Amino acid sequence: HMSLAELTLEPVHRRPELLDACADLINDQWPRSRTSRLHSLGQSSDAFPLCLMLLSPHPVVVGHARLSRVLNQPQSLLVETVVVARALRGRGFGRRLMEGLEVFARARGFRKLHLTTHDQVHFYTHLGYQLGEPVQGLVFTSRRLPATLLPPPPPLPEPIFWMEKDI
Amino acid sequence: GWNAYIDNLMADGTCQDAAIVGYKDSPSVWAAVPGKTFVNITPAEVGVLVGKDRSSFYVNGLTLGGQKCSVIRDSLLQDGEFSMDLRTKSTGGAPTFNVTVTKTDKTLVLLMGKEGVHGGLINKKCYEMASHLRRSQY
Amino acid sequence: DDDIAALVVDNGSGMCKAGFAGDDAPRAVFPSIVGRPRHGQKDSYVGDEAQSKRGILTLKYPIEHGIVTNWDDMEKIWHHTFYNELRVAPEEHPVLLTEAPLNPKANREKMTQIMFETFNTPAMYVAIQAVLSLYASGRTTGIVMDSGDGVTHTVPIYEGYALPHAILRLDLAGRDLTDYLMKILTERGYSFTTTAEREIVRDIKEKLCYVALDFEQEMATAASSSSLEKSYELPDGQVITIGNERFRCPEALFQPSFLGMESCGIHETTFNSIMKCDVDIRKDLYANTVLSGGTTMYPGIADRMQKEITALAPSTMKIKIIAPPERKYSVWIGGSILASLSTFQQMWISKQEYDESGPSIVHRKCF
Ligand SMILES: CC(=O)CSCCNC(=O)CCNC(=O)[C@H](O)C(C)(C)COP(=O)(O)OP(=O)(O)OC[C@H]1O[C@@H](n2cnc3c(N)ncnc32)[C@H](O)[C@@H]1OP(=O)(O)O
Numbered sequence: 067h068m069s070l071a072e073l074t075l076e077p078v079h080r081r082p083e084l085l086d087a088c089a090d091l092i093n094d095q096w097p098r099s100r101t102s103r104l105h106s107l108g109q110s111s112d113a114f115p116l117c118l119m120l121l122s123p124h125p126v127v128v129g130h131a132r133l134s135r136v137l138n139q140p141q142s143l144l145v146e147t148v149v150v151a152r153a154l155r156g157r158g159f160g161r162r163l164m165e166g167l168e169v170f171a172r173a174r175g176f177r178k179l180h181l182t183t184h185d186q187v188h189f190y191t192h193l194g195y196q197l198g199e200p201v202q203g204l205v206f207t208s209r210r211l212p213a214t215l216l217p218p219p220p221p222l223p224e225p226i227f228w229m230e231k232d233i
Numbered sequence: 234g235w236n237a238y239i240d241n242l243m244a245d246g247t248c249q250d251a252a253i254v255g256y257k258d259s260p261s262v263w264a265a266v267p268g269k270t271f272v273n274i275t276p277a278e279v280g281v282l283v284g285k286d287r288s289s290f291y292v293n294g295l296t297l298g299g300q301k302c303s304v305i306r307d308s309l310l311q312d313g314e315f316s317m318d319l320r321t322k323s324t325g326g327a328p329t330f331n332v333t334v335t336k337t338d339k340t341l342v343l344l345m346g347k348e349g350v351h352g353g354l355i356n357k358k359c360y361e362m363a364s365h366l367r368r369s370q371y
Numbered sequence: 372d373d374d375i376a377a378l379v380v381d382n383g384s385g386m387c388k389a390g391f392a393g394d395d396a397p398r399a400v401f402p403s404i405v406g407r408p409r410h411g412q413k414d415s416y417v418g419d420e421a422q423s424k425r426g427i428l429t430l431k432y433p434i435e436h437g438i439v440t441n442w443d444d445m446e447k448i449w450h451h452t453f454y455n456e457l458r459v460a461p462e463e464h465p466v467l468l469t470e471a472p473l474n475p476k477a478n479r480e481k482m483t484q485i486m487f488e489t490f491n492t493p494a495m496y497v498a499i500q501a502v503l504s505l506y507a508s509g510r511t512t513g514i515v516m517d518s519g520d521g522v523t524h525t526v527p528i529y530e531g532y533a534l535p536h537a538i539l540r541l542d543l544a545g546r547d548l549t550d551y552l553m554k555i556l557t558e559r560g561y562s563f564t565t566t567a568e569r570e571i572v573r574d575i576k577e578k579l580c581y582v583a584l585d586f587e588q589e590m591a592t593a594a595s596s597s598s599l600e601k602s603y604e605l606p607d608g609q610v611i612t613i614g615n616e617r618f619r620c621p622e623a624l625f626q627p628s629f630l631g632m633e634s635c636g637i638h639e640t641t642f643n644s645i646m647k648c649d650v651d652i653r654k655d656l657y658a659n660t661v662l663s664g665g666t667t668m669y670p671g672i673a674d675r676m677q678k679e680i681t682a683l684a685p686s687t688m689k690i691k692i693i694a695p696p697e698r699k700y701s702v703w704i705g706g707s708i709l710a711s712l713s714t715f716q717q718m719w720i721s722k723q724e725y726d727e728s729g730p731s732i733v734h735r736k737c738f
Pocket residue numbers: 067068095145146147148149150151154155156157158159160161162181182183184185186187188189190192372
């Protein structure tokens with residue numbers, strides 16, 4: 067799966083003209099209401115969560131992944147919705163997406179990536195992930211919301227993989 | 234023994250305190266988490282919980298093992314409900330916690346959540362243990 | 372997949388607000404009405420469509436005084452909210468609903484049943500409206516005075532938990548004030564009497580009315596000059612003038628006898644609510660009296676509350692009336708906050724819990 071295309075990794079909220087293409091990509095794989103899918107991508111911001119797009123100049127949305135911060139783990143990020151466009155799979159773009167996530171997250175001081183999966187566990191072990199224990203991701207909140215916020219006892223009664231990787 | 238019930242109620246880590254208290258005849262703590270609050274409940278505190286005056290503790294509050302609490306909901310003497318919801322009171326900004334008391338045929342079941350645990354989780358947990366004990370005629 | 376944002380639906384007597392948890396404003400604000408032909412596409416018309424066709428419809432409010440009274444029509448409102456106003460699929464989103472204080476027991480069970488059985492929500496929660504408004508003010512303890520279109524509530528809240536024993540209800544709110552302004556405008560020589568004319572008067576009320584700090588003094592000022600008179604231009608270009616009606620109308624909040632009601636004003640019921648509460652929290656209630664609802668938008672209402680509460684409360688007591696700027700939508704904003712908190716994950720009623728425990732699960736988990 068040697069990869070030959072020139073690719074960049076850019077947040078959706080900096081290329082809003084590509085948000086609709088990114089919704090197409092994700093809904094093709096995991097269909098749900100486009101209203102909801104467009105709103106989720108519209109949450110992307112530098113504060114996290116943010117949606118990264120793997121882009122090709124000649125522009126095509128090759129892939130996407132969502133990064134979210136983790137409750138009580140400042141150096142962790144939760145990776146979700148990892149998908150490469152269906153027609154472009156098997157060309158190395160999935161590896162480069164996950165590797166680009168590591169570079170992006172590490173440049174910002176994060177040291178640990180977390181994600182769930184069932185059917186693609188071997189894809190993640192192949193890229194260096196191993197089994198971990200669960201984490202809770204921090205959802206989007208708008209900047210504008212406040213943010214201040216003796217008888218004997220009777221008898222008693224009687225799946226996904228969590229992957230992590232240090233970066 | 235009854236301590237197995239404290240173990241059971243404490244297993245999932247949501248609560249910091251739990252106890253089973255007999256309220257008939259002379260009340261006494263049948264089982265409780267050692268070194269916490271409920272283990273120190275007095276007969277007088279039991280008497281207020283199950284008593285006829287269901288109005289004074291709204292303005293005066295009540296205590297459980299000496300910890301002052303505020304009454305949120307009181308259904309402790311109502312059939313089908315048999316639960317009371319409270320929140321502890323603190324001084325100097327120290328955190329407060331949600332409490333639920335349920336009333337069976339012979340016991341009061343008390344649960345105190347850890348910090349941040351929602352009272353609905355505590356209420357449901359206490360209600361299910363009480364239902365299990367009523368079904369056993371306890 | 373991304374795990375998806377929760378929906379926040381605030382259902383009021385007059386207006387419904389719907390949007391996504393985490394947003395700072397609802398995506399949809401539409402009237403809580405169902406319309407039927409007085410004497411066509413449908414047997415029924417809902418929300419903005421009923422509004423559009425109101426000329427040929429009799430309008431009904433499924434929510435009276437904050438309480439659902441017509442469940443078939445409320446189901447229509449929720450169907451309109453999900454599929455027409457938000458254009459989402461309800462089975463894909465956790466749903467946060469709001470309820471009026473003291474919402475009857477059977478109503479909140481039925482609310483739960485409809486969300487899970489009819490709309491197949493994967494998870495849901497029910498929050499008291501006043502509590503959400505307190506969250507939007509950046510607080511968890513205090514007393515909220517929520518006056519909307521159909522009901523006014525005073526709701527003391529401790530650490531986010533409403534204290535029902537001290538909740539007081541006043542069947543007097545914005546729609547009654549509009550009705551009153553219609554009446555005293557007629558007594559000024561005009562004729563506002565129809566449903567359509569009523570909507571115009573509502574706009575007059577929202578644009579020109581205010582709360583006087585000293586009502587008797589203000590009546591005297593109005594009788595001795597024209598400095599308080601304003602003009603309002605009707606749709607046909609005709610112009611009316613309004614004087615002491617500007618402040619006589621909202622004065623009914625403080626003097627419900629203006630509407631023929633033998634009921635305490637909002638200031639005095641706020642006070643009675645506080646005196647029903649734990650001795651140890653009254654100081655904080657007095658210092659965190661929060662106004663919410665569209666009927667609290669009148670200029671001067673906070674000052675008037677400050678003065679009236681001060682007269683009733685001990686001379687030592689510190690009294691603070693907070694009027695957040697977005698209080699017309701604080702209930703919804705508060706639900707956006709709550710449904711976005713890390714904690715809120717544990718609070719949902721899941722579809723599985725509902726299958727195990729039935730609708731009465733709402734009584735154990737939502738308070
Ligand atoms: C975190 C979550 O969102 C939940 S887990 C869901 C992961 N996403 C999906 O399942 C969506 C459908 N699938 C896709 O979008 C793509 O297949 C994904 C899985 C995102 C990326 O993979 P692809 O683009 O198709 O493969 P590709 O990068 O070309 O291959 C990278 C290496 O990973 C291996 N690979 C690809 N799919 C694999 C797989 N299912 N299992 C094991 N290995 C896999 C390839 O052999 C390749 O090995 P190497 O030659 O580089 O050493």
